[PDB]
Amino acid sequence: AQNPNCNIMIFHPTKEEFNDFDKYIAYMESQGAHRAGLAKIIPPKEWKARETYDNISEILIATPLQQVASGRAGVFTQYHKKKKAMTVGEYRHLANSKKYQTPPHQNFEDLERKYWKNRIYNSPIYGADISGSLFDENTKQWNLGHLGTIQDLLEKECGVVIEGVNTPYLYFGMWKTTFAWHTEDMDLYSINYLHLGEPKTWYVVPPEHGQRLERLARELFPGSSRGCGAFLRHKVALISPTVLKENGIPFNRITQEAGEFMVTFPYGYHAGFNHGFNCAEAINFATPRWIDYGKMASQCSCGEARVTFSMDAFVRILQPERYDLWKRGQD
Numbered sequence: 345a346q347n348p349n350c351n352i353m354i355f356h357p358t359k360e361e362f363n364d365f366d367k368y369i370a371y372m373e374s375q376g377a378h379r380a381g382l383a384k385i386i387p388p389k390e391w392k393a394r395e396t397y398d399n400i401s402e403i404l405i406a407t408p409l410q411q412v413a414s415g416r417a418g419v420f421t422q423y424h425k426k427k428k429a430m431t432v433g434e435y436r437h438l439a440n441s442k443k444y445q446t447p448p449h450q451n452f453e454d455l456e457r458k459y460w461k462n463r464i465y466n467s468p469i470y471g472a473d474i475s476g477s478l479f480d481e482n483t484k485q486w487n488l489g490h491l492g493t494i495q496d497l498l499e500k501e502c503g504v505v506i507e508g509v510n511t512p513y514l515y516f517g518m519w520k521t522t523f524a525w526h527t528e529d530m531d532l533y534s535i536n537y538l539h540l541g542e543p544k545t546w547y548v549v550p551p552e553h554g555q556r557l558e559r560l561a562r563e564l565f566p567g568s569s570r571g572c573g574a575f576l577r578h579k580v581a582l583i584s585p586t587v588l589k590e591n592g593i594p595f596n597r598i599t600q601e602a603g604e605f606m607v608t609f610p611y612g613y614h615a616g617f618n619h620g621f622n623c624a625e626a627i628n629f630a631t632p633r634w635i636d637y638g639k640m641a642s643q644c645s646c647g648e649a650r651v652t653f654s655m656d657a658f659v660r661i662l663q664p665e666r667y668d669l670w671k672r673g674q675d
């Protein structure tokens with residue numbers, strides 16, 4: 345078995361290997377990358393996502409989210425308070441302001457220490473989940489707006505034609521902006537490209553050990569657990585590396601820098617934080633190996649998780665028994 349310790353692997357494809365996206369994902373899995381839940385892909389040196397980032401300031405963040413924390417430094421939840429619209433140029437200035445800017449630090453480990461010590465005492469503002477793309481249309485390799493769609497994969501694998509679309513989303517982050525512990529909708533893959541700015545630190549639990557994280561989470565968030573049998577679908581709970589180590593949960597960590605891709609694998613729980621002003625782009629995708637994970641994915645039916653139009657069909661076809669209850673949650 346490849347990668348039996350489930351370490352995060354880092355890949356350096358050549359320009360020739362960067363042509364065929366599906367093939368390269370399948371290569372990475374042949375080397376055991378999926379066992380970690382997360383992989384890093386450094387593009388060939390010849391590749392670029394677009395020519396420059398000099399003209400992005402007029403993108404609108406229609407609903408910036410202030411991420412307010414409750415709990416203790418290592419075990420907290422966050423809720424998202426909606427703020428007034430602002431442009432990317434306005435947001436970048438805000439991120440760089442004395443109130444929100446990254447503090448002085450020695451290296452990534454020192455910054456990680458400072459994040460875990462102090463996150464809860466601040467409420468950073470995140471521009472998340474903004475439909476759109478920063479890939480140039482002429483970028484033919486690993487262009488996250490040109491991937492094969494999950495609806496087309498389900499159709500290719502299973503023969504059933506379904507409605508729905510699959511488009512990318514932009515994330516504009518600042519120091520301390522936080523992504524809570526989660527897997528993807530329907531335990532899909534995700535791919536994330538850090539277009540610009542400061543790094544993003546990731547934490548990930550190997551898919552084979554995801555239920556260990558879920559059991560810890562039910563212990564640490566006991567009212568949430570009673571409210572919903574899949575409350576991590578709410579994407580609000582944080583658990584620090586120190587707490588994970590205290591409770592014996594297997595995980596790994598890695599920092600993504602500008603110009604790098606990360607891939608999350610089906611049922612790989614992940615969480616993380618931004619180091620400073622940045623912009624990422626991410627999309628879900630599927631492969632043939634995902635289908636079995638989609639069929640088994642947990643679902644939130646309490647009403648909190650509220651998701652895209654396109655998840656309907658996935659539940660309806662892969663999880664017909666759950667469909668009725670899940671749809672009641674959505675309506």
Ligand SMILES: O=C(O)CNC(=O)C(=O)O
Nearest residue numbers: 515523534535536624626
């Ligand atoms: O970058 C972020 O805030 C969160 N991204 C992801 O969870 C992802 O790409 O799967």
Ligand SMILES: [Mg+2]
Nearest residue numbers: 400401402403
């Ligand atoms: Mg612009």
Ligand code: NI
Nearest residue numbers: 527528534608
């Ligand atoms: Ni994710």
Ligand SMILES: [Zn+2]
Nearest residue numbers: 572644646648
């Ligand atoms: Zn729920």
